[PDB]
Scaffold this active site. Sequence first.
Site, PDB file in Angstrom:
ATOM      1  N   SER A 113       3.514   0.858  10.354  1.00 53.48           N
ATOM      2  CA  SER A 113       4.570   1.129   9.402  1.00 53.48           C
ATOM      3  C   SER A 113       5.506   2.338   9.633  1.00 53.48           C
ATOM      4  CB  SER A 113       3.884   1.136   7.775  1.00 53.48           C
ATOM      5  OG  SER A 113       3.281  -0.051   7.540  1.00 53.48           O
ATOM      6  N   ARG A 154      -0.474  -5.148  10.597  1.00 43.29           N
ATOM      7  CA  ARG A 154       0.902  -4.548  10.748  1.00 43.29           C
ATOM      8  C   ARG A 154       1.733  -4.407  11.921  1.00 43.29           C
ATOM      9  NH1 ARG A 154      -2.333  -4.361   6.861  1.00 43.29           N
ATOM     10  NH2 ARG A 154      -1.539  -4.998   4.358  1.00 43.29           N
ATOM     11  N   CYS A 171      -0.870   4.460   5.608  1.00 42.41           N
ATOM     12  CA  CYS A 171      -0.775   4.413   7.075  1.00 42.41           C
ATOM     13  C   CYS A 171       0.697   5.070   7.783  1.00 42.41           C
ATOM     14  CB  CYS A 171      -0.677   2.806   7.323  1.00 42.41           C
ATOM     15  SG  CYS A 171      -2.230   2.108   7.678  1.00 42.41           S
ATOM     16  N   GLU A 228       0.786  -1.104   0.075  1.00 42.56           N
ATOM     17  CA  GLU A 228       0.070   0.162  -0.105  1.00 42.56           C
ATOM     18  C   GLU A 228       0.791   1.266  -0.036  1.00 42.56           C
ATOM     19  OE1 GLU A 228      -2.129   3.130   0.524  1.00 42.56           O
ATOM     20  OE2 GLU A 228      -0.685   2.624   1.759  1.00 42.56           O
ATOM     21  N   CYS A 272      -5.514  -1.803   5.517  1.00 43.52           N
ATOM     22  CA  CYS A 272      -5.813  -1.974   6.629  1.00 43.52           C
ATOM     23  C   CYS A 272      -7.207  -1.072   7.118  1.00 43.52           C
ATOM     24  CB  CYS A 272      -4.691  -1.564   7.962  1.00 43.52           C
ATOM     25  SG  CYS A 272      -4.073  -0.123   7.631  1.00 43.52           S
ATOM     26  N   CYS A 299       2.901  -0.114   4.559  1.00 39.68           N
ATOM     27  CA  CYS A 299       1.455   0.571   4.292  1.00 39.68           C
ATOM     28  C   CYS A 299       2.103   2.201   4.566  1.00 39.68           C
ATOM     29  CB  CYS A 299       0.638   0.135   5.311  1.00 39.68           C
ATOM     30  SG  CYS A 299      -1.081   1.103   4.640  1.00 39.68           S
ATOM     31  N   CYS A 326      -6.230   4.585   5.692  1.00 36.24           N
ATOM     32  CA  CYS A 326      -5.753   3.429   5.014  1.00 36.24           C
ATOM     33  C   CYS A 326      -7.111   2.403   4.697  1.00 36.24           C
ATOM     34  CB  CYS A 326      -4.702   2.646   5.616  1.00 36.24           C
ATOM     35  SG  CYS A 326      -4.009   1.407   4.738  1.00 36.24           S
ATOM     36  N   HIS A 351      -8.251   1.942  11.821  1.00 40.52           N
ATOM     37  CA  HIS A 351      -7.992   3.262  12.321  1.00 40.52           C
ATOM     38  C   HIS A 351      -9.244   3.516  12.916  1.00 40.52           C
ATOM     39  CE1 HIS A 351      -3.875   4.011  10.973  1.00 40.52           C
ATOM     40  NE2 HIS A 351      -4.026   3.337   9.919  1.00 40.52           N
TER      41      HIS A 351
END
Lengths: 534, 267
Positions: free
Chosen positions: A484, A461, A531, A16, A66, A528, A63, A70
């Site tokens: 990330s 992640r 992210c 991503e 994922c 990501c 994102c 969030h």
Amino acid sequence: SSYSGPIVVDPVTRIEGHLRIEVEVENGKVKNAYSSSTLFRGLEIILKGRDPRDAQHFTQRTCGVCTYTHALASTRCVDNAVGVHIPKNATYIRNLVLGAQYLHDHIVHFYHLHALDFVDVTAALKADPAKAAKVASSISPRKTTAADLKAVQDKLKTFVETGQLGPFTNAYFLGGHPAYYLDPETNLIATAHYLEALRLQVKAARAMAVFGAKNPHTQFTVVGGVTCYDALTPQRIAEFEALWKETKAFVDEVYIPDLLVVAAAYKDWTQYGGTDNFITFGEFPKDEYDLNSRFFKPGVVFKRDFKNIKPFDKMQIEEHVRHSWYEGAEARHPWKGQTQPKYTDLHGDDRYSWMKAPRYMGEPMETGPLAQVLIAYSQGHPKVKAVTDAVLAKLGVGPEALFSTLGRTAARGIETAVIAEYVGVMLQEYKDNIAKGDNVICAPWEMPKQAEGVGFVNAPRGGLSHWIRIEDGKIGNFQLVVPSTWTLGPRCDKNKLSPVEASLIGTPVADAKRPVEILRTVHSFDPCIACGVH
Amino acid sequence: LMGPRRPSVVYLHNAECTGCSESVLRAFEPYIDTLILDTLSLDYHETIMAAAGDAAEAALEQAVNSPHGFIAVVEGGIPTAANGIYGKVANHTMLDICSRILPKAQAVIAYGTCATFGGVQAAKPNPTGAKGVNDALKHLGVKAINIAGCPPNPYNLVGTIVYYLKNKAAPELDSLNRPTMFFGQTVHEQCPRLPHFDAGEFAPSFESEEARKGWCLYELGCKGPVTMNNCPKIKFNQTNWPVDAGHPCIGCSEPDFWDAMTPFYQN
Ligand code: SF4
Ligand code: SF4
Ligand code: F3S
Ligand SMILES: [Mg+2]
């Protein structure tokens, strides 16, 4: 001899977001590396002054890979700031949607993002489908026949002979490549399962929408609980359960056996991509205010010392900007965070990324499946120990093999298998709770004029945290510190290489024009960048 | 990457969260494998393509310069502040990339509210000067078909592509350049809770018995009455949509919705 000089990979695809990797190679091995994130959006700036209830809708758009994570982190954050204790059923429903996210996410990562670093899809055309079927049937309880695999081969043949290779255009394996090791039959099995996974992931994602409205970007969380009264019904629970069961079968019967056959063929990848330090926040709480109530527990490990797991102290996080495109050089705890963009171009004033550089007690920390798995293993987690031991034994390697690109890839599978089983446990507990007559899913709450809050999610992640300062009932400061960011952010003001940068040192590169070995390690972290930067 | 028989698609990622790309992977009847193997030739797409780096750049150039022509699908807003510096791919600004490629497309689809209208990074105070594709590229004559939502229903993307391939032209578009076949009705006029709305039966809180009973979410902020989308009709993932999950519409197929529709829990 071998290649000496720079290599740049920009774009790094099959991640991503927008990543530029730069390395220096000496005699065919990487000697230096930079992780450069090349898009900024500034969601933290945009949130200032807004209603804290709105934060989760903006931050979910950090994102869509994922997705949900969030929204869950912001809602946990504002839940915490307001002091609400959400009902048991909201915790179950939120946890069940998050477990479904991990299964969807990791299956897509292994097949659709990682596997083209290890699978030569065009060699699948030369395979013997009867031989391949025998191999597939030996590694899985699922029976596969020669005709099953010939169907895939026939389809791929028609595709390739059209000359329009589409997503396989200029693949690093076309023509052959010395770092691609699989035989034709194993390439055909993996390619068949890549294609199968394209449809299976539809069901894995649908599982989130059963309770969560839609995927991507769910819409069922509120401060105080969840909104989905339909999630209480036997019909929606049955629908979820059937999608979960089918997804878990795929994990157990298709993904993990493929992971093991590929890892066996690439056992030299136990020698590259290791890291020193690990952080994880725990996930799947029984108590929203106690991380140690989570099925996976939080923890911190330095220098691979898993006999001395350290408690996680949320006050020891600081985010550095000295090598990032932000003003100045001062690291900040996220409740005192600052997001002040200042671009200097690549390596201008020694800055090369839009990610901040989070450090824990000043150290760079890997987060993600390898941190979650190794720390849970070392806490005596029985399910994690049972399947990591089974994986180690199948592969015929010792636990030190885990500190590598291959080990990280294997850890992603181990946690998928363990979470897929745990979703069934959570589901049963949820059913049991409803059966006791608890039908409550949202609790009342009041907005304080002044407050601090933090929400913690262990996402696919790794450790995700959202941090709010409420002032006059509005967002005074909102900071995201994302997995990330930890793993792929740049160096800090002590010039310590981040986990991805350090892990790249020592990577061999057979062919600098097709540097698949760099992609293998970078992809093993599952980057990501939307992210990491937000 | 292409030439012959399947129409070429070049899929670009600007300032985006990859939720619109994920939405296309949820394609149902047809599924994404049929779409990539039979219907279309997906000739550039950073999320799933094999090539990286220079090899990926070479794939993009060969697709855009094809004498066969290509269709562009664009995800994400274009950051324009500071001469485009906030977003780069292969060390080129997204503004420059789109300025060079999109005027060469036979047709452009802006997919998702970020590409159509600027989206989340364009919300106040828009630090990166993010713009939708047609706003950013007005001066170059680009007129992308706008398929809005955050992310859109992938039914609406496939429906528009199929229409385009059949009829060699855009379907009827509204004044925001969105296809009227998908965006011609408010999500409210299609909502199952509309009889409660008509009767003034509103949930006062999410924990209330009225919410449990499925009363209208307008007092809790629902933007269904001002939002054009086909959510209640098509649903998402063949099974649900926001107000059937008990949560108000946040207006996510409308321009500037992050600022126009907020606070999300007020009307
Ligand atoms: S429209 Fe929404 S889902 Fe799509 S890229 Fe933008 S923020 Fe992500
Ligand atoms: S819930 Fe929303 S879309 Fe449905 S009737 Fe009420 S205001 Fe309209
Ligand atoms: S929030 Fe978006 S997905 Fe549909 S229900 Fe409202 S337009
Ligand atoms: Mg941040």
